[PDB]
Design a protein around this nucleic acid. Structure first.
Ligand SMILES: [Mg+2]
Length: 477
RNA sequence: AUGGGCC
RNA sequence: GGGCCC
């Protein structure tokens, strides 16, 4: 995005500067080059002179203004993707009720009750519970008044900036590159679920290459589906953006919202409006009040879907801006927000697409480090998606998601107080696909201290998950 | 202390 | 209630 004006205001907003993450018994063993992100300006692990505030917002470096020709091309790509999207999903995108928006529906989880309320409720000292009844799915007088203001389209707000407390690479911690969460008001989140929650539920149900979205997927089982798909194509590309979310130019966001969320596709007129309120935002970080134009605020509501949609349109745009006669069937892809895997039988020059992405404000690089630029001849087993490689299970013959051993080590090195036993069981579900030997090594430090699931048990559970009838068939002997 | 999924 | 990924 682009920082248009920063101001100092009396109403302070205390950002939390104290990590919940602590080292584990594995930290001594593995010694990862990872650590909790710096949450304080006076963190000793930082480098001298590093001001944590100026680094956080340095991602905002401009709002790329697209030319008329580029904007016209983008709309055609947005309309063409929207056409494909609503062909698969349908046009049953009518507003969710207040009840269904809170409680959720099949395909869409319920709203989190014990989480940040946003502004100006945190200032006033009232949490989500006081404003919204989550059991019965009704709302108090505060939210209901705000809900009507959004119908009238005279609702302004501020995003509350939280520091994201997480494990990050030591290079990023030393640099002061802590990620941030833009906490919007709970009513904005509710109303956004009202306008497009049906659509969102629908995209979770229909995740896959046909719509180019993995939001809603279960890597455990869906890796078989995605793996076999991308194996059929000659070339595959693992593309990486830098600061994807921030570099969504306002022009692109507006066009996308105009083309995807039209009334003729079964949406409410305010579906576009509420989404367009994300383009120009005001962020509240302590005494600072930073107005921003461009980019997407994380923790919005449909941010994964919105980013994923934009990702699809970018590829169609970039290819159409370099090659002639490109349709959606010229290539295939799957994305989860900024994360993206693309494939095609055509020998597409992705190196030559680089400057065409810079017209949108985005900067693309190959996920592979050593190779100097994009190259042809890569397959699905070379790339990475959702932090997982595509490996073949030689026992079942299915594809399985394998995370790098360093990532698993780093995960296991840190944990919140009194949640380690519950975390170990969760992490085992990921680590199982690394193989019996690597699995045993990963959980070596915890033996005796905690309960560790057997490789056997998690493997058998997985086989039933990917294909139930296969598991019963394996009982032939 | 997080909308989005996902045992 | 927790974890993973975005
Ligand atoms: Mg990638």
């Amino acid at each position: 995005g682009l920082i248009v004006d920063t101001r100092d205001v009396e109403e302070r907003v205390h950002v939390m500067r104290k990590t919940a993450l602590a080292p584990t018994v594995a930290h001594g063993v593995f010694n990862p080059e990872f650590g909790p992100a710096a949450l304080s300006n006076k963190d000793p692990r930082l480098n001298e002179g590093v001001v944590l505030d100026e680094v956080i917002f340095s991602k905002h470096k401009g709002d790329t203004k697209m030319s008329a020709e580029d904007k016209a091309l983008f709309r055609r790509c947005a309309a063409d993707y929207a056409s494909r999207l609503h062909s698969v999903l349908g046009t049953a995108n009518a507003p969710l009720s207040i009840y269904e928006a809170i409680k959720g529906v099949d395909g869409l989880d319920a709203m989190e009750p014990d989480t940040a309320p946003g502004l100006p409720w945190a200032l006033q000292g009232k949490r989500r519970g006081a404003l919204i009844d989550f059991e019965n799915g009704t709302v108090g007088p505060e939210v209901e008044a705000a809900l009507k203001l959004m119908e009238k389209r005279e609702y302004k707000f501020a995003c509350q900036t939280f520091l994201k407390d997480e494990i990050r690479p030591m290079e990023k911690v030393r640099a002061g590159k802590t990620r941030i969460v833009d906490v919007l008001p709970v009513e904005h989140i509710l109303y956004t679920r009202m306008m497009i929650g049906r659509f969102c539920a629908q995209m979770h149900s229909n995740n896959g290459p046909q719509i180019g979205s993995a939001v809603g997927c279960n890597p455990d089982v869906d890796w078989q589906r995605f793996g076999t798909h991308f194996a059929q194509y000659r070339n595959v590309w693992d593309v990486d953006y830098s600061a994807f979310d921030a570099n969504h130019c306002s022009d692109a966001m507006n066009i996308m919202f105009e083309e995807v969320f039209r009334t003729e596709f079964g949406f409410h007129p305010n579906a576009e409006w509420i989404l367009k309120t994300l383009v120009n935002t005001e962020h509240a970080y302590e005494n600072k009040r930073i107005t921003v134009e461009g980019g997407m605020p994380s923790g919005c509501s449909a941010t994964s879907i919105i980013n994923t949609i934009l990702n699809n349109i970018y590829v169609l745009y970039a290819l159409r801006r370099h090659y002639e006669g490109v349709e959606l069937d010229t290539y295939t892809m799957i994305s989860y927000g900024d994360d993206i895997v693309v494939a095609s039988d055509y020998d597409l020059d992705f190196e030559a697409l680089k400057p065409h992405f810079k017209s949108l404000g985005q900067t693309i690089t190959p996920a592979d480090k050593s190779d100097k630029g994009f190259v042809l001849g890569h397959s699905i087993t070379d790339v990475t998606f959702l932090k997982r490689h595509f490996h073949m299970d030689y026992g079942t013959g299915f594809y399985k998601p394998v995370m790098a051993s360093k990532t698993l080590e780093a995960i296991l090195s840190f944990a919140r107080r009194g949640t380690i036993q519950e975390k170990l069981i969760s992490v085992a579900g990921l680590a199982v696909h690394s193989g019996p030997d690597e699995y045993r090594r990963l959980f070596e430090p915890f033996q005796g201290l905690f309960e560790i699931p057997s490789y056997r048990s998690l493997y058998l559970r997985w086989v039933n998950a990917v294909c139930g009838d296969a598991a019963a068939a394996l009982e032939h002997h």
